[PDB]
Amino acid sequence: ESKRYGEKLKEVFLMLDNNVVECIKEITESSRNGKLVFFVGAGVSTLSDYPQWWRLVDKYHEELYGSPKKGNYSSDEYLRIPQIFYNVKGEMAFDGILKDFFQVDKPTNPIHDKILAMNPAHVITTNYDNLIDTACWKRGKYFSVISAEEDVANATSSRYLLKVAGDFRKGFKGENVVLKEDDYLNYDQNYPLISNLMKTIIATHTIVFIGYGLGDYNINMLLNWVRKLQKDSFHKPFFIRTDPSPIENETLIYYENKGLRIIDAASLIDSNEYDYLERYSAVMDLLIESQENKFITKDDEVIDYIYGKISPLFALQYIRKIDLKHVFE
């Protein structure tokens, strides 16, 4: 643990392919320059035992028909069942179940802290829990929260916490979040400001995609928007994938040509089929410890961390030694 984990991370750093090393090098540089923006989704919140969306679709399904579905719900059944419930049963009944499920208090997993350990310029989450807001407040990093159209102009600070999928701050109702099918069908007409505010950060910042699946609605919509741009014209987003099985090569080639630079979590380490907290932690600790220069051991590498900090100080003819402990950390 104390020694095992420290040795394991440094050992895994030496076996990584050049692609993962380049991805980590770019992520660390973006974080140091101050242009790193995380994109948290469902998966960084379920580590805090937050309910998954299918557990509410099942409740809607068994309150409409009478029995849970015999299988896993598809992408259409995630938006169509709650819409059938809203149309048939009504709106107050649709909000009673939301109040029952989402009126819970849960802790903040360590990942929520690690995301704040890299100093992200912004944070773009597509979930409605206040776990990330609580973590940011407790760690002392003030972030202006933007969960409504009226919040875009009234931004007190410069760092954002854009919740592009609504929020339950104003109350536990379905008019503040995007859950049904018609909510997605009218997202660009009901949220015209948070769409621009999200598409601008993606184009003028480094983006990471922790906590997301590789076939989500949001990821595919973002890739559809990205394909409408020109030749390169922007930085390809990084995608931390933490699924149990290793990613197939065909599906990796298919997605790496659409913009993603995938960093699979179940390839640097071997873990159990349910140890998700130890798959997020591998990538996050790899990035954080790459920031701290722990994974630096070579003769030519010390002539880069030394030249890369002394070379700018060449126009000056004689710099003081009292502040020379500032050009280095």
The residues that touch a second copy, with contacts defined as CB under 8 A, are 64-65, 71-72, 74-76, 80, 83-84, 87-88, 185, 215, 224, 248, 250-251, 253-254, 257
Residues 57-76 that bind ligand NAD (CB under 6 A): 72-73
Give the count of residues interacting with ligand NAD (CB under 6 A).
Answer: 14
Query: Is residue 101 near ligand NAD by the rule CB under 6 A?
Result: no
3-state secondary structure of 6: helix
Q: Kindly state the smallest distance separating residue 247's Cβ from ligand NAD, in Å.
A: 11
Consecutive H or E run containing 10: helix 4-15
Query: Is residue 54 near ligand NAD by the rule CB under 6 A?
Result: yes
Q: Kindly state the smallest distance separating residue 251's Cβ from a second copy, in Å.
A: 7
Query: What is the identity of the amino acid at 287?
Result: L
By beta-carbon proximity to ligand NAD, the closer residue of 179 and 197 is: 179
Consecutive H or E run containing 263: strand 261-264
Query: Is residue 52 near ligand NAD by the rule CB under 6 A?
Result: yes
By beta-carbon proximity to ligand NAD, the closer residue of 112 and 146 is: 112
Other CB atoms within 10 A of residue 167 CB:
21
Q: What is the spatial distance between Cα 41 and Cα 128, in angstroms, rounded to a whole number?
A: 10
Query: Is residue 217 near ligand NAD by the rule CB under 6 A?
Result: no
CA-angle at 73, arms to 76 and 71, nearest 5°: 145
Partner whose binding site includes residue 213, from a second copy, ligand NAD, none (CB under 5 to 8 Å by kind): ligand NAD
Query: Is residue 276 near ligand NAD by the rule CB under 6 A?
Result: yes
- Specify the residue for token string 């010390």: 302
Q: What is the spatial distance between Cα 39 and Cα 210, in angstroms, rounded to a whole number?
A: 6
Residue 231 near residue 261, CB atoms below 8 Å: no
List 24, 40, 47, 282, residue binding ligand NAD (CB under 6 A)? 47
Closest CB to ligand NAD: residue number: 43
The CA dihedral of 42, 278, 267, 222, to the nearest 10 degrees, is 20
List 125, 147, 242, 291, residue binding ligand NAD (CB under 6 A)? 242
Partner whose binding site includes residue 254, from a second copy, ligand NAD, none (CB under 5 to 8 Å by kind): a second copy
Q: Kindly state the smallest distance separating residue 41's Cβ from a second copy, in Å.
A: 17
Residues 6+ apart with CB under 8 A from 123: 37, 38, 40, 115, 132, 136, 143, 160, 161, 162
Q: Which two tokens stand for residue 87?
A: 């149309």
Helical packing angle, 54-64 and 75-88, nearest 10°: 50
3-state secondary structure of 97: helix
Chain centroid offset of residue 329 CA: 29
Query: Is residue 42 near ligand NAD by the rule CB under 6 A?
Result: yes
Consecutive H or E run containing 208: strand 206-208
Q: Kindly state the smallest distance separating residue 274's Cβ from ligand NAD, in Å.
A: 7
Query: Is residue 46 near ligand NAD by the rule CB under 6 A?
Result: yes
- Specify the residue for token string 């994109």: 39
Q: Kindly state the smallest distance separating residue 138's Cβ from ligand NAD, in Å.
A: 22
Query: Is residue 125 near ligand NAD by the rule CB under 6 A?
Result: no
Partner whose binding site includes residue 64, from ligand NAD, a second copy, none (CB under 5 to 8 Å by kind): a second copy
> In the complex, which residues of this chain contact ligand NAD (CB under 6 A)?
42-43, 46-47, 52, 54, 72-73, 211-213, 242-243, 276
